[PDB]
């Protein structure tokens, strides 16, 4: 574990801190994350979760009670890429490519019973070849948190990842966060103000959730054409199904891959300034 020379700190992960590093032994350049015991097992589980759109976990080093995770390294994250494309916007075909690749990754994970649980632009990594990859699966930003989590569901599903990805999809298109709440309640109310306060008609069981309160103000659902213009109907339709309140109504990654929005998907390459 002293076979790694640090080159720079590329992130302050929720869990710990992430470093760009190089293996003195195998010379490869990597991302090193400086982090109980079921941890060692579950994380270890993640090593065999290998897919082109999932950052590979290379090595797990437990030592000196200082768990080190060694990941494949990518030079840029989507957050920085969005900020750099803010003035011109990311071209739709690249938005579409990225969404499609991300859905492929999730459908893979989800098929193996792994959730990400904390998808955010910072956790999506891109390379020069037009690839995008899911990073840093969880075992401050609440902007991408699905409403069932905010309402106190402890046994949430793979649908929470579809929620987050839809929020990111929206942000790529409009160049502004869909629901930038700065508290849990603010986050929930921003969602309600836009998609309308949910009730038993559109979400059976919602008024029985642990943090649901009858006193929640009741907002009407906003015009969906108002939310992500000027995205086309293929796009809006896929996004609406990604943002269904009811987790069991929310589209699955696998079905999303079949939506007509991806009829003409291609794989462009971003112009990256590393
Ligand atoms: O390339 C990486 N692989 C990783 C694996 C796990 C975690 Br956590 C982060 C990263 C990576 C990161 N690469 C970056 C490039 C610019 C800014 C931030 C990051 C990362 O954060």
User: Is the Cβ atom of 89 under 6 angstroms away from ligand 1?
Assistant: no
CA of residue 261 to ligand 1 center, whole Å? 29
Q: What is the CATH number of the domain that holds 86?
A: 1.10.510.10
Residue 120 in marked binding region: yes
Counted residue by residue, the chain has a size of: 274
Does ligand 1 come within 6 angstroms of the Cβ of 54?
Answer: no
Class of residue 75 by CB neighbours under 10 A (exposed 0-12, middle 13-18, buried 19+)? middle
Cβ(10) – ligand 1 distance below 6 Å: yes
Query: Does residue 34 have its Cβ closer than 6 Å to ligand 1?
Result: no
Q: Are residues 118 and 71 in the same domain?
A: no
**Same structural domain for residues 136 and 257?**
yes
Question: What is the rounded distance in angstroms from the CA atom of residue 133 to the CA atom of residue 123?
Answer: 8
* Centre of ligand 1 from the C-alpha of residue 77, in Å: 7
45 vs 100: CA distance, rounded Å: 25
Q: Which of 51, 75, 99 is the last residue of a domain?
A: 75
* Number of domains the chain is built from: 2
CATH code of residue 34: 3.30.200.20
Contact yes or no for 228/173 (Cβ under 8 A): yes
* 262 shares a domain with 217: yes
Q: How far apart are CA 247 and CA 177, in angstroms?
A: 22
Same domain as 108, residue 2: no
Q: Does residue 232 have an active-site annotation?
A: no
User: 223: buried, middle or exposed (CB in 10 Å: 19+, 13-18, 0-12)?
Assistant: exposed
Residue 72 annotated as part of some ligand binding site: yes
Same domain, 141 and 9: no
CA distance 208 to 200: 9
Q: Is 264 a known ligand-binding residue?
A: no
**CB of 71 sitting under 6 A from ligand 1:** yes
**Domain stop point among 52, 75, 98:** 75
Same domain, 138 and 253: yes
**Does residue 23 have a known ligand-binding role?**
no
- Is 204 among the annotated ligand-binding positions? no
Q: Contact at 8 Å (CB) between 1 and 63? A: yes
Residue 54 has a CB neighbour count (10 Å cut-off) of 21
Dist. CA 193 → ligand 1 center (Å): 34
CB of 30 closer than 6 A to ligand 1?
no
177-211 in b/e form (b: 16+ CB < 10 A) is bbbebeeeeebbbbbbebbebbeeeebeebeebee
Please tell me whether residue 41 adopts helix, strand or coil conformation: helix
Residues 215 and 164 reside in one and the same domain? yes
Looking at the structure, do residues 261 and 251 belong to the same domain, yes or no? yes
Residues 119 and 227 grouped into a single domain: yes
Q: Please list, residue by residue across 128-162, b when 16 or more beta carbons sit within 10 angstroms of its beta carbon and e when fewer do.
A: eebbbbbbbbeeebbbbbbbbbbbebeebbbbbbb
Q: CA nearest 120: which of 171, 46, 182, 72?
A: 171
Distance 186 CA to ligand 1 centre (A): 29
Distance from C-alpha of 181 to C-alpha of 144, rounded to nearest angstrom: 9
Nearest residue (CA) to ligand 1, atom 8: 136
Neighbour count for residue 227 (Cβ, 10 Å): 18
Catalytic residue among 59, 83, 118, 211: 118
**Solved using:** X-ray
For residues 88 and 115, membership in a common domain is answered with yes
Among candidate residues 75, 106, 130, the one where a domain is terminated: 75
Residue 80's contacts (CB-CB under 8 Å, 6 or more residues apart) are: none
Do 167 and 45 reside in the same domain of the chain?
no
- Domain containing 140 equals 76-272
Residues 252 and 231 in one domain: yes
Instruction: Please give the Cα distance from 204 to 207 (Å, whole number).
Output: 8
Breaks (C-N over 2.5 A) in the chain follow: 35, 139
Element (H, E) at 125: strand 124-126
């Amino acid at each position: 574990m002293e076979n790694f020379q640090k080159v720079e700190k590329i992130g302050e992960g929720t869990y710990g801190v992430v470093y760009k590093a190089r293996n003195k032994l195998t010379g490869e350049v990597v991302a090193l994350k400086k982090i109980p015991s079921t941890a060692i097992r579950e994380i270890s589980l993640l090593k065999e979760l290998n897919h082109p759109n999932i950052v590979k976990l290379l090595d797990v080093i437990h030592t000196e009670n200082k768990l080190y995770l060694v990941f494949e390294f990518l030079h840029q994250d989507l957050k920085k890429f969005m900020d750099a494309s803010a003035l011109t916007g990311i071209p739709l075909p690249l938005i579409k490519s990225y969404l499609f690749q991300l859905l492929q990754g999730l459908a893979f994970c989800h098929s193996h019973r792994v959730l990400h649980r904390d998808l955010k632009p910072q956790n999506l990594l891109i390379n020069t070849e037009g690839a995008i990859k899911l990073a840093d699966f969880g075992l401050v930003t609440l902007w991408y948190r699905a409403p069932e989590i905010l309402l106190g569901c402890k046994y949430y599903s793979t649908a929470v990842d579809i929620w987050s990805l839809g929020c990111i999809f929206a942000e790529m298109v409009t160049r502004r966060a869909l629901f930038p709440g700065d508290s849990e309640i603010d986050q929930l109310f921003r969602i309600f103000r836009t998609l309308g306060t949910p009730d038993e008609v559109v979400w059976p069981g919602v008024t029985s959730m642990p943090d649901y309160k009858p006193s929640f103000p009741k907002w009407a659902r906003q015009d969906f054409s108002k939310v992500v213009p000027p995205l086309d109907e293929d796009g809006r339709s896929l996004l609406s199904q990604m943002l269904h309140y009811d987790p069991n109504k929310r589209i699955s990654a696998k079905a999303a891959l079949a939506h007509p929005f991806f009829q003409d998907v291609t794989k462009p390459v971003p112009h990256l300034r590393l």
